[PDB]
Each structure stands twice: as C-alpha cells, then as structure tokens.
Amino acid sequence: KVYGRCELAAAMKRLGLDNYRGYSLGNWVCAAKFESNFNTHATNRNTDGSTDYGILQINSRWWCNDGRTPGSKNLCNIPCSALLSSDITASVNCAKKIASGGNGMNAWVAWRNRCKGTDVHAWIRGCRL
Numbered sequence: 794k795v796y797g798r799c800e801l802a803a804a805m806k807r808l809g810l811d812n813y814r815g816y817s818l819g820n821w822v823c824a825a826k827f828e829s830n831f832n833t834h835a836t837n838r839n840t841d842g843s844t845d846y847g848i849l850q851i852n853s854r855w856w857c858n859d860g861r862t863p864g865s866k867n868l869c870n871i872p873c874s875a876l877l878s879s880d881i882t883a884s885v886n887c888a889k890k891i892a893s894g895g896n897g898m899n900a901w902v903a904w905r906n907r908c909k910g911t912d913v914h915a916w917i918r919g920c921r922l
Contacts, residue, residue, distance in 0.1 A: 794879035796831040796848070798822065799920035801881075806922050808885045814892055818922075819913035820904065821888070825849060826916070827903035833884075834877055847876035847884050850901070856887055 796804070802822050805811075811818040828850040829835035837845045843854040843862050853862040857873035869887035876884050891900050898904050 794833045796825075796833070798826070798831070798916065801825060801831055801848075802917045802920045803922060804881055805885065808882065809889075810885060813889060814897060816892065816898055817913060819916035820898060820908060822916040823908035823911075823913050824898065824901050824904040827907045828901060833879055833881070836877075844873070846873045848881060849876075849884050849888050850903070851876055851884065851887055851891070856891065 802818060805821050806818055810816075810821045825831055825848050829848045831848065833848050835847060835850065837850065839845060839852065839854070841854065843852050843865075844859060845852050846857065846859070851857060851869070851873075853859045853865050853873050855866050856869045857871050857876060858865045858867040859873035869890055871883055871887060876887070892898055894900060898909070
C-alpha cells in the first residue's frame with residue numbers, strides 16, 4: 794500500500810508515535826517519506842546480506858527475521874514479512890524499540906539526512922488529527 798501523507802500521519806498518531814521519546818509526529822512522517830515514499834512494499838538490500846523492509850526500512854540483521862539473513866537477532870520478535878503489510882502496526886511497534894536505542898531516530902539515516910533539525914511540523918500541516 795502507498796499511504797497518503799495525512800492518512801499515514803493519522804495512522805501513526807493512533808499508534809502512539811506523537812511525542813514518543815521526545816519526537817513529535819512529523820519526525821515519523823518525514824522519516825517514512827524519505828525511507829520509502831510511504832510504500833509499505835519498499836525493500837532494499839544491504840551489502841551485508843541483510844535487507845531493509847517496509848515503510849520504515851527496518852533491517853533484518855537486528856530487528857526482524859526474514860529466514861535468509863544469517864545470525865539475525867530479531868529484536869522485534871517478528872517475521873520481516875509482517876513489515877510489508879498494509880497495516881502498519883508491526884512496523885510502528887518495532888520502530889519504537891529501535892528509537893529506544895541510545896541514538897534514537899538517528900538509526901534512520903534518511904531521517905538524519907533529510908529531516909532532523911528542520912521544521913518537521915510541516916509534515917502534518919493540513920491533516921485533521
């Protein structure tokens with residue numbers, strides 16, 4: 794599924810992301826945009842045998858098991874296929890665990906590069922939340 798900007802913002806709000814570990818909702822929307830262009834089917838290989846899955850490009854080395862990544866730690870306790878669903882619940886619950894790491898949202902390089910430090914409130918402007 795390819796989400797609309799405000800459709801995604803609303804779904805994320807209902808799942809508890811606004812102000813999670815000090816990050817306002819627009820951070821998460823902006824991250825999703827630059828990670829996947831809002832496409833739940835997005836995948837990208839990593840040069841290490843792991844793969845990034847879904848709207849938030851969550852990797853199979855640490856976070857989910859895809860059955861083809863040697864030594865996956867599967868910290869989110871989920872098959873990576875669950876991150877490709879039209880329902881973003883699994884992706885959001887996993888994303889909260891990633892953002893609980895020392896470096897927070899810096900785990901997403903696209904967020905660091907394109908979102909961090911900007912007025913991310915813009916990403917939820919015009920949405921009825």
